[PDB]
Amino acid sequence: AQNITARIGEPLVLKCKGAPKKPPQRLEWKLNTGRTEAWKVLSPQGGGPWDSVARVLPNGSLFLPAVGIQDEGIFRCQAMNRNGKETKSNYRVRVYQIPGKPEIVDSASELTAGVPNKVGTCVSEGSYPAGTLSWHLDGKPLVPNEKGVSVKEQTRRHPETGLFTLQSELMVTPARGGDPRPTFSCSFSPGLPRHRALRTAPIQPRVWEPV
């Protein structure tokens, strides 16, 4: 049943299939989401508190002003022409949100070519879903296990807004006689196959020999 993604706090319209543009219409909207467990059905326009959340338009389509988190789920619409021609619609809804540009904090301007050093802590604020936080070296990706690399990831959730926060502190051990001018960048990339990663502005500290 058709996959659908929509940004939280935006609007969204679900076109009821085979329904006449202006009443009389024989339509029905079922919906399974966070706000209703399991199924709820709506009457046309009225004083009920659902006309702020999701209501049917003259067009016949269902329309929600502010898609939120609790609106992830399943939306069904069964329609009827005068002749009886059934035409149904099965909408699977998932909601997303892009977080602020990934800034680095606690960064370091100089590091030694001897011991592991903390490069910095990457921070992304207000996402959905969480998604990864990958560090990069000279435009190329890096691997946490080897060589002489470490990563200290994390993930929170704001109890109110339901949005996520990610932290990815890095640590490296520069190979002796290696490049004194590395170049590090972090990035947020959601799991979906659309939005590109949000890179951070590259930092490039220096690798001094110890003594």
Question: Residue 19: how many CB atoms within 10 A of its CB?
Answer: 21
User: Residue 104 is part of a domain; what is its CATH number?
Assistant: 2.60.40.10
Residues 92 and 120 in one domain: no
Q: Do 113 and 203 have their domain in common? A: yes
What does the alpha-carbon distance between residue 41 and residue 12 come to, in Å, rounded to a whole number? 18
How many domains in the chain? Answer: 2
Q: From CA 126, how far away is CA 162, in angstroms rounded?
A: 9
Q: Is the domain of 109 the same as that of 91? A: no
User: Of 77, 98, 119, at which residue does a domain stop?
Assistant: 98
Query: Is there a contact between 99 and 126 (Cβ–Cβ < 8 Å)?
Result: yes
55 neighbors 27 (Cβ within 8 angstroms)? no
> Residue type at 82?
R
Task: Find, among 162, 112, 153, the residue nearest to 134 by Cα.
Answer: 153
SS3 assignment for the chain: CCEEEEECCCCEEECCCCCCCCCCCEEEEEEECCCCCCCEECCCCCCCCCCCCCEECCCCCEEECCCCCCCCEEEEEEEECCCCCEEEEEEEEEEEECCCCCEEECCCCEEECCCCEEEEEEEEEEEECCCEEEEEECCEECCCCCCCEEEEEEEEECCCCCCEEEEEEEEECCCCCCCCCCCEEEEEECCCCCCCCEECCCECCEEECCC
Among 98, 128, 148, the domain boundary falls at: 98
Which experimental technique did the depositors report for determining this structure? X-ray
> Whole domain around residue 190: which residue ranges?
99-211
- Judgement on whether residues 52 and 153 belong to the same structural domain of the protein: no
- In this structure, the number of other CB atoms found within 10 A of the CB of residue 26 comes to 13
**Separation CA 112–CA 117 (nearest Å):** 7
Q: Which two tokens stand for residue 121?
A: 């802590």
Burial class (CB in 10 A: 0-12, 13-18, 19+), 11: exposed
- The Cα 128–Cα 145 span in angstroms is 27
CA distances from 148 to 57, 75, 122 (A): 60, 50, 19
SS (H, E, C) 55-79: EECCCCCEEECCCCCCCCEEEEEEE
Burial class (CB in 10 A: 0-12, 13-18, 19+), 22: exposed
Torsion of CA 34, 36, 39, 43, to 10 degrees: -130
Closest CA to 62 of 10, 53, 73, 88: 53
| Residues in Cβ contact with 58 at an 8 Å cutoff, skipping those fewer than 6 apart | 21, 22, 23
Q: Are 115 and 178 in contact (CB under 8 A)?
A: no
Q: Are residues 16 and 113 in the same domain?
A: no
Omega within 30 of 0 (cis) for the link into 30: no
Examine the domain organization and report whether 166 and 203 are in the same domain.
yes
| Cis peptide preceding 201, ω within 30 of 0 | no
Domain boundary among 58, 73, 98: 98
Select from 189, 24, 49 the least CA-distant residue to 122: 189
Closest to 77 in 3D by CA, of 94, 96, 57 = 57
Strand 55-56 and strand 12-14: pairing? Answer: unpaired
Distance (Å, whole) CA 54 – CA 72:
13
Residue count of the chain, please give it: 211
Q: How far apart are the first and last CA of the chain?
A: 65
